[PDB]
């Protein structure tokens, strides 16, 4: 189904990090989380809730932090403000930075309900409550189905 992914070889276009230092390594995002909960902006393209069953993030945390925070998903109607934010629990993603097929279920991430499946999220702020200068390596952001 939806399998859209952003390779990080070409910098961090679209997936820039606000309030954070997004150092880029070809093929990965060596993002440093300067803020306690920095938000990573997403490309403007809308993503259908139904099409994506999960977010197949390639993210692994090279540093050891406590990844969490309410990721901001905004459908065009919702707006970045308000909207639905899911505070994902630490999924025990490797703190050693070993490769992880991190999965965030879109079906689980209902943006206020089944309306999300119909709704298309134009922009995503990836909140990363963790630690000062927490380091994560993000190879890609694949979609699910």
Q: Annotate the chain with three-state secondary structure.
A: CCCCCCCCCCCCCCCCEECCEEEEECCEEEEEECCCCCEECCCCCCEECCCCCEEEECCECCCCCCCECEEEEEECCCCCCCCEEEECCCCCCCCCCCCCCEEEECCCCCCCCCHHHHCEEEEEEEECECCCCEEEEECCEEECC
Distance from C-alpha of 64 to C-alpha of 131, rounded to nearest angstrom: 9
Residues with Cβ < 8 Å from 79, sequence gap 6 or more? none
- Most distant CA pair in the chain: distance in Å? 39
Q: How far apart are CA 62 and CA 117, in angstroms?
A: 33
Which residues have CB under 8 Å from 142's CB, separation 6+? Answer: 3, 4, 5, 55, 56, 57, 58
The C-alpha atoms of residue 114 and residue 109 are separated, in whole angstroms, by 10
Distances (CA, A) of 34 to 21, 58, 98, 134, 143: 7, 21, 22, 7, 27
- Experimental method reported for this structure: cryo-EM
End-to-end CA distance of the chain: 5
List 32's β-bridge partners, or say none: 21, 135
Q: Which residues pair with 73 in a beta bridge?
A: 84, 124
User: HSE (CB half, 13 Å, CA atoms) of 101?
Assistant: 3
- Strand-pairing partners, residue 29, are 24, 138
Distance CA 126, CA 21 (A): 14
Q: From CA 8, how far away is CA 114, in angstroms rounded? A: 31
Strand partners, 74: 123
């Amino acid at each position: 189904t939806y399998a859209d992914a952003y390779e990080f070889l070409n910098s961090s276009e679209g997936w820039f990090a606000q309030n954070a230092a997004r150092t880029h390594e070809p093929g990965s995002l060596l993002v440093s989380a300067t803020a306690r909960d920095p938000r990573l902006i997403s490309p403007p393209l809308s993503i259908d809730g139904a099409a994506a069953r999960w977010i197949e993030i390639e993210f692994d945390r090279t540093s050891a932090p406590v990844w969490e925070g309410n990721v901001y998903y905004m459908t065009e109607d919702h707006g970045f403000a308000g909207a639905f934010r899911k505070v994902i629990s630490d999924a025990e993603a490797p703190a050693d930075g070993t490769r992880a097929r991190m999965l965030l279920d879109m079906h689980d991430l209902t943006l206020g309900g089944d309306d999300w499946r119909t709704s298309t999220i134009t922009r995503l702020r990836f909140d990363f409550s963790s630690e000062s200068d927490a380091v994560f390596r993000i190879h890609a952001i694949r979609l699910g189905g």
